[PDB]
């Protein structure tokens, strides 16, 4: 039985325009571990993406945290683009507010 | 098979090089070698807790290993020092780690480190025959054989009647005798006694034999004593049954 | 682990029941194991104990306290062959085995019809020592080391002949002494009065 | 102190395109020790166990955690031949154990296939519990050797006890600390709460005086920064006022938010 990624986008702290926050995207309950994540902007893939080590649950599914250092503006589109064995194509979520 | 080691004895000078053999067939991850030494717990000298990794033990200094393949962990000793004289075990176990497994050990091998080879002695052997006083008292007959004067202490003693080697009716000391306690590198003697009916004793047909092995110089040991070279023999001496 | 006790050496007779403590002062555990050592042979597994409790395997039974840091092997109806050290060891929070000094086991024979006497046995052509045997004396009799040096008194020896479920104590003595007599080999040795010195 | 758990994971793959095998160990949520098969190396995870744990320790367990892995790939072997099964598949140990408040104390240890439960040990009847007939084959050999059953039961009685002790007095700074959450209430009524460590909170939304549940909720997540967020919604009956309120506990702290 495989398990499809759960995937959530959030700033660290509540986002206001200026004021420099995190974007993160936390990738949970997925079975197997591979996995490849990137984090976008306007629709393109950002370089300065750093994330934790995969982690373990105890219902034997994994996560991961991807995070960038960011400053939301109105203009500005953030995504998160996952990709596992268990989706037909790459899925994406935006960055909600 | 088991755990398999070699050699069962070894002298070596000061200065020599060393390489001790182990093998297990039972298909055992875990591979230790050991010394045991007189008023201590066994010491552990490197362990491999599974192919393709080993690591140091508690007294790690003086010797290093391989582990060879799965089935085989042999132990170098670098330059042999007095201090590593000693026996030593290799052991096995299907996994450490696994918390109720035991070892399974190996023979042992004792390593005797002498600074020269010169006081490196083979046993004398002799056998003593039956008090006929006993023979009267008890109706039984004790033969006596006695191996003396040897160094150092690498020999196995064993009775041999119509020629055949026998161990009911016999005791050997389970430890050697100091000629002279008082010396650090004196000499050893050992006592057996083989015990028959007298009717046995009295059938001058039947043939007692005291055979003591002794480990000792190889062929590529120097010597430059003018006694004979003590090399690894056996020494011999017998008995008839009277009437 | 720091460090395991156990007694260096314990004596009891043949029938009897005999308890052998082991104390641990250890880093965490996980287990006491203990093994059997033969004189010359290697030692293996007797037994291994990591909860609270007796566990029973035949003549011989463990015994684990773990609050008290302390286990013992018993042992019932001793026989010659329980002769032997025990060796206690202990697995630690890391896995790895403190190992106890050992215990040497001794065991006195029941000796049925004790008969001590000092006999001396034949010459040798090949050789030059006389040679005294003090034998079938009782268990409770202790052979002393020699005082005089240039005569050799090994400790006494336990032998069982099965054909004939017999057992006995011997003591060999020899000398290349002129001077040397088997009616005085073993008078630095407290034994039987009843000792038979058959006339030389 | 709060309740808290030590638990040390175990991943074999089998045909890996990546690593054949990891183990890591937390304290919490927090990752405390790393090994896998690439790095075939020990080493910590928090500053807290690299100052506390002198080289030896991580010498050691490197060795054993090598022997691990071996032990691991060739277990994997045997479910495979029996479950018949081709391809790349999974094999996972759980142990570990937690430290109640009341001083009570778990202990757990489990293995799974392809993510899904195989093995399951009861300390208490000192019997394994198998989820189908593979399962069953190998609780049968376990079963068979009494003195492992026993082992593991002190192990996870006593040691792995002992063991998050120890832990929890090096990482006391992390593992022990309090920050309480921020609350506030959006709207569809959000109640969101942030900035907060440890990790375990309790929100609920209350309709006057009865828990309403038709509430949503959402996970606990990491901010990045070593504290979290989550929050809970409802919705508001859009005919009849009523008086919501948002319930939030954290470290024995009780907060409610009116509307």
């Given at each position: 039985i495989q398990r499809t990624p759960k995937i959530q986008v959030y700033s660290r702290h509540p986002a206001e325009n200026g004021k420099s926050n995190f974007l993160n995207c936390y990738v949970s309950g997925?079975?197997?571990?591979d996995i490849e994540v990137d984090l976008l902007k306007n629709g393109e893939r950002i370089e300065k993406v750093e994330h934790s080590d995969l982690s373990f649950s105890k219902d034997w599914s994994f996560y991961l945290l991807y995070y960038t250092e960011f400053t939301p503006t109105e203009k500005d589109e953030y995504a998160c683009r996952v990709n596992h064995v268990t989706l037909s194509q790459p899925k994406i979520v935006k960055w909600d507010r | 098979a088991g755990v398999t080691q070699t050699p069962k004895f070894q002298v070596l000078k000061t200065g020599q090089s060393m390489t001790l053999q182990c093998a297990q067939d039972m298909n055992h991850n875990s591979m230790y070698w050991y010394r045991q030494d007189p008023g201590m717990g066994l010491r552990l000298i490197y362990y491999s807790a599974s192919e393709g990794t080993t690591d140091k033990g508690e007294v790690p200094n003086g010797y290093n290993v391989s582990r060879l393949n799965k089935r085989e962990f042999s132990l170098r000793l670098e330059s042999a020092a007095p201090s590593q004289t000693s026996v030593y075990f290799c052991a096995s176990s299907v996994?450490?780690?696994?918390?109720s497994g035991e070892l399974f050990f190996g023979e042992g091998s004792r390593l005797t480190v002498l600074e020269?080879?010169?006081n490196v002695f083979p046993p004398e052997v002799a056998v003593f025959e039956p008090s006929e006083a006993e023979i009267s008292h008890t109706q039984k007959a004790t033969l006596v054989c006695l191996a003396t004067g040897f160094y150092p202490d690498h020999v196995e003693l064993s009775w041999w009647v119509n020629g055949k080697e026998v161990h009911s009716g016999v005791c050997t000391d389970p430890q050697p005798l100091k000629?002279?306690?008082?010396?650090?590198?004196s000499r050893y003697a050992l006592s057996s006694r083989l015990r028959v009916s007298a009717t046995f004793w009295q059938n001058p047909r039947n043939h007692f034999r005291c055979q003591v092995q002794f480990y000792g110089l190889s062929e590529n040991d120097e010597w430059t004593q003018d006694r004979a070279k003590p090399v690894t023999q056996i020494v011999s001496a017998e008995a008839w049954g009277r009437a | 682990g720091q460090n395991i006790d156990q007694p260096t050496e314990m004596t009891a007779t043949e029938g009897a029941i005999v308890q052998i403590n082991c104390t641990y002062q250890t880093s965490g555990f996980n287990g006491l194991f203990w093994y059997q050592q033969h004189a010359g042979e290697a030692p293996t597994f007797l037994s291994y104990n990591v909860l609270d409790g007796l566990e029973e395997k035949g003549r011989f039974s463990s015994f684990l306290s773990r609050s008290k840091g302390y286990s013992y092997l018993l042992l019932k109806e001793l026989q010659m062959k329980d002769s032997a050290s025990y060796l206690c060891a202990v697995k630690d929070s890391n896995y790895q085995l403190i190992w106890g000094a050992g215990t040497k086991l001794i065991i006195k024979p029941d000796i049925q019809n004790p008969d001590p006497a000092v006999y001396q046995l034949r010459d040798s052509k090949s050789s030059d020592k006389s040679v005294c045997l003090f034998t079938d004396f009782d268990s409770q009799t202790n052979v002393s080391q020699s005082k005089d040096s240039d005569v050799y008194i090994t400790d006494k020896c336990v032998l069982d002949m099965r054909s004939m479920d017999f057992k006995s104590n011997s003591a060999v003595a020899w000398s290349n002494k002129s001077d040397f007599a088997c009616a005085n080999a073993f008078n630095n040795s407290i034994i039987p009065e009843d000792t038979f010195f058959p006339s030389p | 102190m709060r309740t808290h758990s030590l638990r040390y994971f175990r991943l074999g793959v089998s045909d890996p395109i990546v690593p054949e095998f990891i183990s890591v160990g937390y304290v919490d949520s927090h990752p405390i020790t790393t090994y896998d098969s690439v790095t075939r190396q020990k080493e910590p995870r928090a500053p807290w166990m690299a100052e506390n744990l002198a080289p030896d320790h991580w010498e050691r367990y490197t060795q054993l955690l090598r022997g691990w892995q071996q032990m691991f790939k060739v277990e994997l072997k045997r479910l495979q031949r029996h479950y018949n099964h081709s391809g790349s598949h999974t094999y996972q140990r759980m142990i570990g154990c937690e430290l109640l408040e009341d001083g009570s104390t778990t202990g757990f240890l489990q293995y799974a296939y392809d993510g899904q439960d195989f093995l399951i040990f009861n300390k208490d009847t000192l019997s394994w519990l198998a989820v189908d007939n593979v399962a069953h084959t190998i609780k049968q050999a376990w079963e068979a050797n009494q003195h492992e059953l026993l082992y593991q039961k002190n192990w996870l009685e006593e040691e792995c006890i002992a063991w998050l002790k120890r832990f929890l007095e090096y990482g006391k700074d992390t593992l022990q600390r309090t920050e309480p959450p921020l609350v506030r209430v959006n709207r569809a009524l959000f109640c969101k709460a942030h900035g907060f460590y440890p990790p375990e909170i309790y929100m609920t939304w209350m309709k006057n005086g009865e828990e309403i549940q038709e509430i949503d909720y959402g996970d606990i997540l990491p901010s990045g920064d070593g504290t979290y967020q989550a929050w809970a919604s409802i919705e508001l009956d859009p005919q009849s006022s009523n008086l919501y309120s948002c319930h939030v506990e954290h470290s024995g702290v009780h907060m409610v938010l009116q509307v």
């Open positions: 997925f079975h197997p571990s | 996994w450490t780690g696994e918390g020269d080879l010169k000629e002279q306690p008082a010396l650090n590198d | - | -």
